[PDB]
Amino acid sequence: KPPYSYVALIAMAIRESAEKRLTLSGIYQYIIAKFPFYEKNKKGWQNSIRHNLSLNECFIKVPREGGGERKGNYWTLDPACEDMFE
DNA sequence: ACTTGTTTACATTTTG
DNA sequence: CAAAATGTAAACAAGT
């Protein structure tokens, strides 16, 4: 098991991201590629990821431009919590 | 059928 | 000795 908190994995997925933002499935793919450990039991840890993403205010939800209206929004970091490293 | 998102509830962990 | 951070499970609502 990798030694990172779920909040750290989301943060790390968003920073390595191009646009410094990520859809949900972007976070998932980053975590699943980077660590094959999270290839097993996706349902449980992806619930923990949604729980952390919703509950932690350091993460901010960014919709599409104007009316993009896609399946989810993007996710980004807060310009105050990004000082905290992983 | 599912994905996404919010929230509650409870268990575990980690140091003043 | 709670407390705060964190993990896990789960019920539930809104959405081409």
Side-chain angles (χ1 to χ4, degrees):
Chain A
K1 177 176 173 174
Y4 299 107
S5 62
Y6 281 123
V7 173
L9 293 153
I10 298 162
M12 162 198 316
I14 289 184
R15 277 162 195 157
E16 269 85 320
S17 69
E19 323 98 310
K20 293 281 171 294
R21 64 184 203 257
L22 268 191
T23 178
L24 188 44
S25 39
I27 314 168
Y28 285 1
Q29 294 173 44
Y30 179 89
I31 286 158
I32 300 179
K34 250 270 179 295
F35 312 96
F37 172 82
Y38 295 102
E39 187 174 348
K40 281 173 57 188
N41 184 255
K42 281 165 288 159
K43 148 190 181 188
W45 65 258
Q46 289 170 7
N47 191 306
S48 306
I49 282 281
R50 293 187 312 276
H51 169 81
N52 274 268
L53 253 180
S54 196
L55 201 291
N56 189 318
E57 309 292 304
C58 285
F59 297 134
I60 318 174
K61 209 186 313 175
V62 172
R64 319 285 173 168
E65 171 213 350
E69 307 170 52
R70 185 130 90 87
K71 166 64 140 293
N73 311 277
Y74 288 89
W75 295 96
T76 59
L77 273 183
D78 187 304
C81 300
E82 100 299 1
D83 299 69
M84 159 276 188
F85 210 60
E86 46 74 20

